[PDB]
Design a protein around this ligand. Sequence first.
Ligand code: CL
Ligand code: CL
Ligand code: ZN
Ligand code: ZN
Ligand code: ZN
Ligand code: ZN
Ligand code: ZN
Ligand code: ZN
Ligand code: ZN
Ligand code: ZN
Ligand code: ZN
Ligand code: ZN
Ligand code: ZN
Ligand code: ZN
Lengths: 87, 90
Amino acid sequence: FKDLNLTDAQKQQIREIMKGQRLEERRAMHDIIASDTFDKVKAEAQIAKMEEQRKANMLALMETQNKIYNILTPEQKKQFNANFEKR
Amino acid sequence: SFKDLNLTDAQKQQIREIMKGQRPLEERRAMHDIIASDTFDKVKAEAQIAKMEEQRKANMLALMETQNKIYNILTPEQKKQFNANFEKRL
Ligand SMILES: [Cl-]
Ligand SMILES: [Cl-]
Ligand SMILES: [Zn+2]
Ligand SMILES: [Zn+2]
Ligand SMILES: [Zn+2]
Ligand SMILES: [Zn+2]
Ligand SMILES: [Zn+2]
Ligand SMILES: [Zn+2]
Ligand SMILES: [Zn+2]
Ligand SMILES: [Zn+2]
Ligand SMILES: [Zn+2]
Ligand SMILES: [Zn+2]
Ligand SMILES: [Zn+2]
Ligand SMILES: [Zn+2]
């Protein structure tokens, strides 16, 4: 949600930023959870594998937000930053 | 949804015992710095993302072990319900 007063040109720019963005993991988790015994080495392997997808996801998320920040006016950026503190 | 499984009295005590270990904004502030810049610095971002790898590992190991311990006190009918629920979850 946004109390930023986005102009229609800005909302268009944003929608375009989002579209430019563009289970196996959970399955492995499931097997760790459902096992008779807890296998720490196997869990560590799954955690490490998960770091790769987290990296990809956090990079897309940050880049997207940065792109949005930089189409805002100075007044809109203040509000964005204030909102960021509140989450 | 472990609460959703009609836990027996004994299971609630066992969980209580298990859930004993079972146990941060500086990362947020760094994210904020990356986002509110007039360029996106992928190298700085990558470093930010990597910084709490060890803490993430420790926390996830604890969570996975705890969830494995709880799964194993379940009855066969409770396990079926847990697994079916699992197949529908983010
Ligand atoms: Cl699954
Ligand atoms: Cl099965
Ligand atoms: Zn266009
Ligand atoms: Zn599954
Ligand atoms: Zn499997
Ligand atoms: Zn078995
Ligand atoms: Zn070992
Ligand atoms: Zn990579
Ligand atoms: Zn006990
Ligand atoms: Zn600080
Ligand atoms: Zn500059
Ligand atoms: Zn590392
Ligand atoms: Zn688990
Ligand atoms: Zn299955």
